Subunit: 456 residues, 4 copies
C-alpha cells in the first residue's frame, strides 16, 4: 500500500563488470602479496576500496565538461566554480587544488609549524600525514562513544568539548587551529551535530583560535543533521550547509567525495591572511591560482556537482543504499560500526574473525577472505593502517580493527549490495574455522598499508 | 549460501527523475486528453511507454561515438557496421536506414504490391501499417495458444505451421514472402523456437518463397532458445544468432531495441535481387547508401552494441529484470501474459479492471489509472491499438486487451521495479471500485492510438 | 596597418587526414568505376563531396548532446527544438524529420498529387525526385542570368516573376504551392533577395497560393541580404531571418546544412491544415511526432545550432572561407559560377576541360582528374546529374556542366583551401592535354549519378 | 605547381572567440594592474600565455576518455599509460603525477638536498623553484650562443660541455644529478642535439652521475633532430625518441605539452632506487601510485596522445605553424630569438621598444601594448620573471628581455597567426613613440611575475 523507496535518478551509461573464479583470485591475491591495493582493477568484481573519486557523474556534469575552459589564467570554468562555492558556503577566498591531500599540503605548509598540536575529531590518514610530517601532533578529541561499535547514537562523530577545552588550556600557545572532519570518516563515517559545531566554535572563540572543516563529506553531514537533529527537520540541505560553514573560518575539501567528481579539491576561507599565505604553495605544488592542477572541464563538473549534491533527494538516494546494506548485514547478524554512516559500512573485524590473534591482523585477514570469497575488495581500517609507534617500533593494537566497505556513489545497485552481504555472510558463517591471519614480510616506514607485503 | 543475482554491469552516468503530485497528474492527464503519448516527458515519473531507443548505452558505445566518421559517402563507420552485421548474421548485403519502420518502408516498397498477402506471426503495428498501406493483407498465423494469457509454454510466439501451410496452398501466387518476428512483440514479447524457424523454412522451401525476419529483438530470442530449447544449453548467443539467420533470406531491424542504441536500423539480406531492388528507395527516403539517415557516430555505436548485446551476461541481466518484475506481479496476484517475455510485461487488463465494459476500453482505462497512481506511463496494446474495421467502422473487441510495461534497457533499477508493481498492486486492489473507462471524443482514420482524444 | 580577417572561433578537437599516392588513387578510382560516391572515406584526402551533415559542431552543441532526452513521447529535447524554431521563424507547427528529403517525403505525400506542377527557382535533386516521383512537374522559374556563369550579379538565385506569373496564369488550377529554395543550391549556392521574396509573395497572393521555403541554407541567404541588399546593412541575421519567413507559409529544412548538425530536419508551418495533413506520414515514415527519426541529443544539438548559426560572426567566418577559395581560383584564372555563393564553388567545367566532347562528360571527367591529382573529392553538377529524358532516353546537354566544391562547415583551414586551388590549377594548366572523358558502362533508371559505372 | 603545405588533421569541434574594444581593454588591463595573468579568459581575444595544457585533443583521445577507469587502485587506464611510456622510452618504472611541477616536487624531495648544485641547460622556472626552494643551486650551463638572439644555429639549446665539465670537476661531491631540458624552453624553445645528449652522457659517466631529462617537449626536440642533425633524416620520431632516452637515467614530464592533454604528468626511470625513493612523496602529495592526481580518463587520453604526437606529420603541422608566424615577423622586420623554436616565438623586446629604459621593464611593457592593440595575451620572459637577487634585493637586468608568444597546439589557424603578426607590426611601427613602461607597485618575495601589481 505504501510505495517502496527507489532512486531519485535513472541510469544513462553503463560499463562492464568482470567476474572471476576462486582459482584465479587465489593466484591474484598471492601476486599482490595479500595487499588489495596491489590488485589490478580487472581482478576485482565489486570494488569497495574507497568512495573517493570513484562515483558516477550526472548528465549535467558531463554537459558542463563539454564547456570546460582550458585557458591557463582566468578560465571561465574557475570563476564558475568559485562563485558556486562562495554562494554555497559564504567563503570569499578560494584556492583550487587537484585533490584533498593537495589542499592539505598547500594550506598546512603555511599553517603547521614544528611542535604545534592540531586538535580535532578523528583526523583522516592523509590529513594526519601532513601534520605529523611537519613534526606536529594530530590530537584526537572524538567522544569516547565512537569506539563502542555496537552503541547506537545519532552523532557518533562529535568532538568531546571537554577534551578540546583541555588541550587548549594546556597548549593554546602552540595550537594553530582546530580541525573538525564532517562527516567523521575514520570513526566510521559518523556525523557531527550542529550543536557540536557551535560547541567547537564557542571554545575556539574563548581561545581566539580559527576553525577548519575537513569537508569531503559535508553534504552527507548536512543530511544527517536534517534527519536527526531536532530543529532542522524542515531546513534545506543548502540551508544547513551554509549554517555549518558560518561556524568555520575555512574549509579544505576533497571534492572527489561530496562533489561526486573523479578529481578535484579546494581550500576556501574567510580569512585574507590564510588566502594570501597559501597562494605561494599552490603555484609551486599544484598550478596557477585559477586551476590548481584541475582541468577546466573538471572545475565545471565540480561546480555542477556541488549544486546537485546539496539537494535532499540525491543525498537520500545515496545514504539509503548504505543503510540498505546495513539492514542486510543486521539480517545476517554481522557486526559493524553502528549506526550506518554516510558513505561506507565498517565491519567490526574483532567480532567476525574471533579465532584469529590480534597480532595476526584480523581485519586485514577478513579483507583477504572476502576477496577470495566473491572478488569484493574492501579496505582495512585497523592495526596495519594505524602504523607502528615511531620510537617503540611496536604495533598499536588498542584501536578499532575494521573492514571498511566504501560505496562509490551511484555505481552499484541494491542487487550488488545483496551480493556483498551474502559473500560476507558466507565468510562470517565459517568463523570457527578461520584461525591464522597474515604476517608482514616487507614493511614501509610510514603509511605502510599502501605498500605492505604479507603472507598467509 | 548461494550468492544472489546482480547485474553484469555497473553505472557510469546518471540523469534525474522528476516526481509529482496526484493533483499535478490529474491536470496533466486531462490536458493530454487521457492519451499518454501526449504527456510531456517531464510529467512522467517512470516511463515504460516503450523499450525502443530509450536504453542506456555503454562506455564502449560512447567511445565508438567519439570516432564517428561523418562523411557523406563511404564513411569508415558504415563499413564498420556492415562487417559487424555480416560477421554476426552471414548476410553480405546491407542497407542502412534510420529506424525500423524506415527499413520496412524501404524494403516493402520493392516487395509489397497491391493484393499480396504477407503471412507470419503477429505483425508489429508499423510493420502492419506498411503492408496494409500498400493495399496488402498482413495475415496472422501465430499459434492459438498465444491468446491464452495464463497458459505457460516456452515458445508462445511460434508460427503455427498448419496455418502457414494453408495460406500458401490457397494463395501462394500472391504471397511475396513470409515474415517471422523474433521475439514476437505483439503476442507479448514471446520467443520463437529454432525448431519453429526450421518448420517455417521447410514450408517456405516447398513453395519456393523467401523468409524475412523482423529482428528488432533477435538477441532476446536467442537467449530464450539457449535457456529453453533442448540441444542449445551449451551454445553461445553468437552461435545461436547465426544458426537463426541461416534460416532466413533477409532481415529488417530496428536497432533501437537489441542494438541498445537510441537510433538506427538496417535491412540485411543474402539476395542480390532484394539489395538491388531496395537501393533506390533508400536514396529517396533515407539518405545515401552508406549512412541511410544515420550519423556516423550512430553507426559506430550500433556496431559496438550489436557485438556487446550478443553476449550472454548482458542479455541475462536485462531479461532477469523483466522476470523479477513478473515475480512481483505474481506475488500480488496481478495477471499478465505468461510466461514473462524479453522486454516488457503485458498486464491482462480484462482480468484487472473487471468492473469496466469492454466498450469503455479497460486496458486504456488501466493505463490512465496507473499514471494517476504513481506517474508510471505504460502503453495500451488492446482495443484502441487494434483500430476499427475499414469497412464496418466497428471496434474489434475479440483480441487481447493488454497494458504493456516496456522496460528501457539498463535504465531503471529493481527498486524502480518494486515501485511499479506496488503502484499496480494499489490499482488492482481497488478494482471493485473502477467502473467507468474512457470514450473516444476525437479519432483518427488509422493508427488512432497515437493521436486519439478521450474523456473520463 | 588594418588587421586581416580571422575566424570568429578556435579549434577544440581534431581528427586525422589520410594522404595517398597517385598510384593508390589510380586503382581506387578504378575499383569505384570512376564514380567518386563509391570511393571509401579513407581513400579521400580532402572531401568536398557535400556540405550536408559533414560539419564540425561547437562545444555548446556537444554540451547540448549530453543533455538529450531519449524518451519516445514528449522529450524535453523536442520542445526545446520546437520553441527555438517558433522563436526564430514565427511558425507554430513543427514536425520533426530525420533529414531534408524525409521532410519533403512527409510533406509532399500530403501536398503533391499526380498532374500537379510545382513552380519555383531551381529545385534541389532530392526535392525534384519527390515531385517527379509523384508524377508531378518541377518547373524551374529561375532568372535566365543564373546560366551566365561569368555574369556577376548580387542575387543570381532569384525567381523570375514573369516566369512565375506565366505558369500560374496557365495552370493555377493544378499548382498546389510555390517553392523557393534559399540560397539557390543548384544554381550555384546563389542568394535570393528580400525584394524577390516579396515579389513571390505578391504573385502567390494574387492566385491565393501558399509559399514553401526549402530552407537548408536560409542563414547563408540572410547573410547575403545583410551584405548586398540596400536597406538591410544594419539588421541582425535573426531580424532578417524572421522577415524572410514572414513571407512564407511553411518551410522544409535539412538542418544538416545551416543547423550545422550531422543529422536532422523538420517541417515548420503556419497552416494547421498542413500540420494535420502531414502528421500521419511522419508516424509512418519517420517516427513519433516528438522525435521524427531524430535522437533527443540530436534535436538538442539542432536547437543550439540554429541559435548559434543565426549570428553574423559565425556566418561571416564560413562564407569568407568560400570567398577566399574563390579569390585563389581567380588568381589562377579558373572559371566558376560568379559570384562565389554561400557553401561551395561551382567550377565551370565547360571552360576548363575544353578539349573534351560534351558527350564524353567534361565535369565528370574533371571530377576524376582532380581526385587523381591530389585526392580531393568533388561532385558533378552537370550532364550526368541531370538524368536522361524519361521518354526520349537521351542525355540533356544544354544545362550547366559544373564541378561543385562543397565546403564542410568549420572542418578545413584556409591552408587546405590553398591545396585545393593549387591542385585545380595543375589540372587546369594541362587542359590542352585532356582529350577523352568517360563513358557510361552501367546506368540506373533515375538518379543514376549515385550509382553509375563508367570507364576512362 | 608544387602543392603548398596544409595541416595533417581537420577540425571536429570548435568553440567561440570573444572580441573586444580598446576602451574595454584599457579598463580590463587596469583592473588587472597591468599583469596579464590577472586578466579573465573572457577578456582575451587570442590567448598565447602558454602552450601548457591549452591544446586541442583528437577524436581518438576523446574516445580514450570515454573508456577511463576511475578505480582508485590498479585502474586499467594506468597500466595503459605505463606500457605506452615503457614502450616509447625504455623506462620500466613509472610514477604518475598530475602535472610537471608535481613530478619535480615528488622526485626532487627525494633527490635534492640543501647545498647541492644541479647543473644543466636553462632550467624552467617551476623547476628552478623546486631546486632553489630546497636551498640548492640551479646552475645554467647552456652554450653562450643562446643569448645572441639574432645568431642562427641549429641547436641553440645545447649544453656547453666545457661548462658542465667545470662544475663537476669542482663540486662533483654535491652534484646529485644533471638535468637536460628538451627542447630548451627558457632559451626560446631551442633544440638539443643527439650529439650533445651523448656529450652529456659521456661526462656524466666520467663522474658517475645520473642524467634526468625534463621532457615536456621531447617530441618537438625529436623533430628538430630529424630535420637538422645529419644522420637522422631517415629515422622515425619514435626511433629518435628511444635513442634520446637511452642516454638518460630518468625523465620528468609535463604531459600538458607534448602529450597534448589538458592535464597530466609523470616521472619515469630505469633506476629502482629513484622509483622506490619517490613513491612515498607521490602518495603524500599527489595520490595513490596508480593515478597520481590524474583521472583515469586523463591517463587514457595521455596514453593515446603520447603515441599520436610521436608521429612526424602531427609534429610537422604544429612546428610549421610556429615557423609561419616567424616568417610573418621576419616580413615585418620584428626581431625574435632565431631560429624559430618548437612551441613559441620569443620576441626580443630589447630591440622593439628601444625608447623604454630597462629599469621600466620593456618586455613587460610590450606585453601590455600588444594586449591593448588587439587583445592578444603573451607572456614576459625577461627581467620581472628573473626575480630579484635574494641578498642584494636588486633587479637582474643582464639577461634576455623577451615577449613569449606561446601557441596552444591545434587551436588557432594561420589566419589567427596573421592577426598576431599584424598587431605586433602595428606596435613595432610606433616604437619611436613608446617611452615609458611600468613600475612595480606591489611585489611578491619569489616568483613575483604571477602576482605582481604594476602601473603605467
Ligand atoms: C579522501 C579523504 C581526504 C583526502 O582527499 P584525497 O582527494 O584522496 O587526497 C581528506 N579527508 C577525508 C575525510 C578523506 O576521506
Ligand atoms: C519497434 C518495432 C519496429 C519498428 O521500429 P522503429 O524503430 O520504432 O521504427 C518494428 N518491429 C518491431 C517488432 C518493433 O517492436
Ligand atoms: C541537402 C539538400 C536537401 C536534402 O536534405 P538531405 O538532408 O540531404 O536529405 C534539400 N534541399 C537542399 C537545397 C539541399 O541542398
Ligand atoms: C610547463 C613546464 C614545466 C612544468 O609543467 P607544469 O605542468 O606547468 O607544472 C616543466 N618544464 C618545462 C620545460 C615547462 O615548460
Amino acid at each position: 500500500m505504501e510505495l517502496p523507496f527507489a532512486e531519485s535518478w535513472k541510469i544513462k551509461m553503463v560499463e562492464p563488470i568482470r567476474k572471476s573464479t576462486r582459482e584465479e583470485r587465489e593466484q591474484w591475491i598471492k601476486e599482490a602479496h595479500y595487499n588489495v591495493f596491489q590488485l589490478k582493477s580487472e581482478q576485482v568484481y565489486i570494488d569497495l576500496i574507497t568512495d573517493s573519486g570513484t562515483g558516477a557523474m550526472s548528465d549535467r556534469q558531463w554537459a558542463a565538461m563539454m564547456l570546460g575552459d582550458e585557458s591557463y589564467a582566468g578560465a571561465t570554468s574557475f570563476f564558475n566554480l568559485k562563485n558556486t562555492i562562495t554562494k554555497l558556503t559564504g567563503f570569499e577566498y578560494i584556492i583550487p587544488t587537484h585533490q584533498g591531500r593537495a589542499a592539505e599540503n598547500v594550506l598546512f605548509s603555511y599553517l603547521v609549524h614544528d611542535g604545534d598540536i592540531v586538535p580535532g575529531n578523528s583526523h583522516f590518514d592523509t590529513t594526519k600525514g601532513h601534520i605529523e610530517g611537519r613534526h606536529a601532533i594530530a590530537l584526537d578529541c572524538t567522544i569516547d562513544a565512537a569506539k563502542d561499535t555496537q552503541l547506537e547514537i545519532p552523532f557518533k562523530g562529535n568532538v568531546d568539548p571537554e577534551k578540546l577545552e583541555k588541550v587548549l588550556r594546556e597548549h593554546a600557545d602552540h595550537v594553530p587551529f582546530i580541525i573538525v572532519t564532517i562527516t567523521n570518516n575514520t570513526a566510521g563515517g559518523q556525523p557531527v551535530s550542529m550543536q557540536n559545531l557551535r560547541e567547537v566554535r564557542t571554545i575556539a572563540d574563548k581561545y581566539n583560535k580559527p576553525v577548519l572543516f575537513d569537508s569531503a563529506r559535508f553534504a552527507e553531514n548536512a543530511y544527517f543533521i536534517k534527519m536527526r537533529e531536532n530543529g532542522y527537520q524542515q531546513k534545506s540541505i543548502k540551508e544547513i550547509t551554509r549554517e555549518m560553514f558560518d561556524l568555520a573560518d575555512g574549509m579544505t575539501m576533497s571534492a572527489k567525495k561530496d562533489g561526486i567528481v573523479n578529481m578535484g579539491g579546494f581550500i576556501a576561507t574567510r580569512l585574507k591572511e590564510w588566502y594570501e599565505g597559501a597562494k605561494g604553495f599552490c603555484v609551486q605544488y599544484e598550478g596557477y591560482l585559477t586551476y590548481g592542477g584541475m582541468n577546466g572541464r573538471d572545475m565545471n563538473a565540480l561546480a555542477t556537482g556541488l549544486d546537485e549534491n546539496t539537494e535532499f533527494d540525491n543525498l537520500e538516494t545515496r545514504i539509503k543504499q548504505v543503510e540498505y546494506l546495513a539492514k542486510k548485514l543486521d539480517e545476517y547478524g554481522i557486526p559493524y560500526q553502528r549506526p550506518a554512516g554516510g558513505h561506507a559500512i565498517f565491519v567490526d573485524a574483532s567480532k567476525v574473525l574471533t579465532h584469529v590473534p590480534k597480532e595476526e591482523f584480523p581485519a586485514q585477514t577478513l579483507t583477504v577472505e572476502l576477496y577470495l570469497e566473491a572478488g569484493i575488495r574492501g579496505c582495512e581500517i585497523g592495526y596495519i593502517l594505524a602504523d607502528r609507534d615511531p620510537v617503540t617500533h611496536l604495533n598499536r593494537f588498542n584501536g578499532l580493527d575494521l573492514l571498511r566497505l566504501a560505496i562509490p556513489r551511484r555505481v552499484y545497485t541494491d542487487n550488488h549490495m545483496n551480493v556483498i552481504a551474502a559473500a560476507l555472510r558466507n565468510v562470517y558463517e565459517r568463523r570457527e574455522s578461520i584461525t591464522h591471519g597474515v604476517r608482514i614480510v616487507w614493511e614501509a616506514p610510514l603509511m605502510r598499508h599502501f605498500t605492505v607485503q604479507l603472507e598467509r
